[PDB]
């Protein structure tokens, strides 16, 4: 069987007449006739008959007509599926994340991406920054989001944005601070930071910001992540410092106060393997920039 | 595009190597290469880098289906020429294949002597796409999500059975209730096509007020049975599975008036070809009661 | 074995490299090496090949727990010396951490002023092992499989809510039934600790006579919420999650007298230390009613 | 803190007297005393007191006594866990399989393995022979089972056993053959073989066996696997040839007849990466041989 044979047969069949089929096909009589004899020979069946009315289909012809249509319909749609995949119009972007960008910044970036590529999908996985590097190099994830990525030569970092910092305290300690504050005002406050590890982290950044401001902080403890800190704060057992992403959410019993200062800010970045980027990733990277 | 291109692309995809593709095709390299170049120019996309691009992986699946449909279409025209019913393409997922599906197929073939049948394991999502595109005629499984152009027919219901290694047979007898199994570590199946058989089993336990002990969820009934036969597991299976006598496996029927699961089939409600129309009339009266 | 060996092994495991282990430890290579040789001779096993052997991967997990327990034990003796209650080590899985767990912890801390708390996310299996070994005092989740030396206490029950992107809020109002959600593509969570929250949601749909439409099962509530906030999903979450106002997410309370899920805690029934004994008496009367 | 300090403190505490502790410790008085002062100094608490009775513990001492016991208990058990993992007494053997060994031979081999290594576990995954090679080289699976593995230099093949072949027919065609038969007697029987592909398969083997016997078989079709063939046979639409593993199971409506001949046999083999075998695999390989 050949594709040309199929499109001709459908036209011959639908037009119900040879001259009318030629008009639709932009082609002369003799090529059409050649393609029908070749088609009937391959199948080993007669598909067409003549009469006063012109062209008629046998039982074999009628059965083949429906299939010929489903075949060109599927072929046409399969062509589109392949071009769509080259363009990055479709595909599943595998995203990894660590730390607080997952609370607001990352989702909004995903909203904007899905909105300009509505037939794409995303998956999400929590991963340490080290896991993200390994996974990126290996191709198990396309893009990773966190704050302070360790250095690697085969990976591009893109600082998407920066975020303010907010003191977080139990509802009952609200109004000891107001809605705005400075790092100087927190030297009597026992602070719970996160995460632990020591490799460049949000905790270490906050500690450095206190050192820049010439202030000794009281760090009561470093907990495993923001969830722990927020839950301790909600339970009345702690105060913390958190980026704007976290403060954008209304958590019952927690109040926030923005820490003022030009330098008191924290980045959001994302990493990807700059080499051999599949189209869904290239489309996302072009959105990140 | 051209059928030869598709057939050659599949061989290059599956051999993963130009010389093995030549071996499988009985043809030299430069012809394969000119056919691959031509497919790429016709599609306006690149499929090969030997490994596949995104566009390539996408097109591979479709190419198989196009060739598949083309072959069945030739067979169908021939069948129509001879006055025979031709071949019903059935897809299946889950355990109906063990007994209840064969029995229904037998009754269909008895009443329809010139018909044949082919069977393909497919996931439910693959099935839906197969029905809308015309590559399969009908799918069987247990639970199917509704879909606009598809009818889902609940044919019959099957009892459930506890499966255990022969060494543990005495422990529960030949009939048991869900509450008797509250301490049994269960290996359920399958994974992914949720809600699946595992989900229904777990739901039945819950309706009875029991949280099942789930050791693991394995990929299919085959894995679960092999593990039970190896002495490493216990499971719960439909009657279709328990109708078979497996060495080293003992079964206990689970009693409870609601402890049953459906055998269901699905098909495209519109543009039904003759053989599907015949099978549906048969399913219709197989379901009656 | 020796504590220094354990601490050094962990640093070699986590740095994946002898010079980074030296950097993290402020110590040169030959001391680290002699400590690793010695741990290997003492154990009568090889842990390093820098990557880990099977024996190494096994011991790594345990080494962390041994050091963890050792640190908490020093803190506990000190607390006992001063007449303070000391620190309750709590583990958690699932969504109680969002609201109901913090609230119960607050009431405990109010009545027990010299106490503190630490929070660690753990899977249910990790929790059980933690309770039997004495590394944690108590675990929280929703469903827990029975286990000989563990008591499971159902504290309270939480309502369920549909979660949708703000754009879709009008569609269901502020209250809805499960049957109203029969066409909603749901993103449930988590994966693996079956039976989990996903299983209960699916079971509730089934009890009501509806097969839920499940688009996907994601790793946790964080993923599901980020996807819903990005406009890519709808989900079902307990009241603890819905008590929080998340930007771009709207909630509808699911009505039905049986549509609720438990908050549960688990602890070792034997050899309870004083602080756990205090927490249990508190949980006991928090559950009363 | 040091481990020696812990074991001494427990003995001193349990014996309730210094001389009695020395007896238990196989050690003199002065070292014991040195280890207690060092231990009290590290913790920064007093654990012990003297009186007429001998040794007594403070509140700090009593709290530390329970922890010291849990610490040595956990350390001891962690040592065992590491040695067990070196020996391959524990671990999860990842097994892959293709074709019919999964029906009987593979499970019995797993029974025997689990029986001599009862704290080990197994997982099972269906994989093509090509997938198994890739997975083996990569370390994603430990061992693969099938029949006719393609050649690779970094992989060892071990023929575990051979299996007879059996004609399979619908119940109603039983007694056209009896319980034994020859290939010559099947030249009028339309045969359904499996699987398709063409790379060395069970189908190709059966075809070669007919050629060795100087007999033209009637091969009506090659289907995707044994499940398809068995289901077609059960439905009355086919006869097939299957190895002994399949014939060992009683499938309703299928009858079997053994094909006699010294050469009419099919192997079961398994493959593994001979390089860098983890202990659980080495333990299994030693069982396979």
Automatic annotation (TrEMBL), chains B, C:
The lineage of its organism: Bacteria, Pseudomonadati, Pseudomonadota, Betaproteobacteria, Burkholderiales. GO terms for cellular component: protein-DNA complex. Keywords: DNA-binding, Plasmid, Transcription, Transcription regulation. Pfam families: HTH_1, LysR_substrate. This is LysR-type regulatory protein. One of its GO terms (molecular function) is DNA-binding transcription factor activity. Belongs to the LysR transcriptional regulatory family. Residues 1-53 form the HTH lysR-type domain. It comes from Cupriavidus necator.
């Amino acid at each position: 069987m050949e594709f040309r044979q199929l499109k001709y047969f459908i036209a011959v069949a639908e037009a119900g007449n040879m001259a009318a089929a030629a008009k639709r096909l932009h082609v002369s009589q003799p090529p059409i006739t050649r393609q029908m004899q070749a088609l009937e020979a391959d199948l080993g069946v007669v598909l067409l008959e003549r009469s006063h009315r012109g062209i008629e289909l046998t039982a074999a012809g009628h059965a083949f007509l429906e299939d010929a249509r489903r075949i060109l319909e599927l072929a046409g749609r399969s062509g589109d599926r392949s071009r769509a995949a080259a363009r990055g119009d479709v595909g599943e972007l595998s995203v990894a994340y660590f730390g607080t960008p997952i609370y607001r910044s990352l989702p909004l970036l995903l909203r904007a991406f899905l909105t300009s590529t509505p037939t794409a999908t995303v998956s999400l996985t929590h991963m340490t920054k080290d896991e993200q590097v390994e996974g990126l190099l290996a191709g198990t994830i396309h893009v990773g989001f966190s704050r302070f990525f360790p250095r690697h030569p085969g990976i591009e970092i893109v600082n998407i944005a920066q975020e303010d910092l907010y003191l977080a305290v139990h509802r009952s300690q609200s109004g000891k601070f107001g809605k705005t504050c400075k790092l100087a005002d927190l030297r009597a406050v026992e602070l719970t930071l996160f995460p632990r590890g020591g490799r460049p982290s949000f905790a270490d950044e906050v500690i450095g910001l206190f050192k820049h401001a010439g202030i000794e902080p009281r760090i009561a403890r470093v907990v495993e992540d923001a969830t722990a800190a927020l839950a301790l704060t909600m339970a009345g057992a702690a105060s913390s410092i958190v980026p704007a992403s976290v403060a954008a959410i209304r958590w019952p019993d927690i109040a926030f106060a923005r820490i003022v200062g030009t330098r008191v800010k924290v980045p959001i970045s994302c990493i990807f393997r700059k080499e051999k980027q599949p189209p869904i990733l290239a489309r996302f990277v072009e959105h990140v920039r």
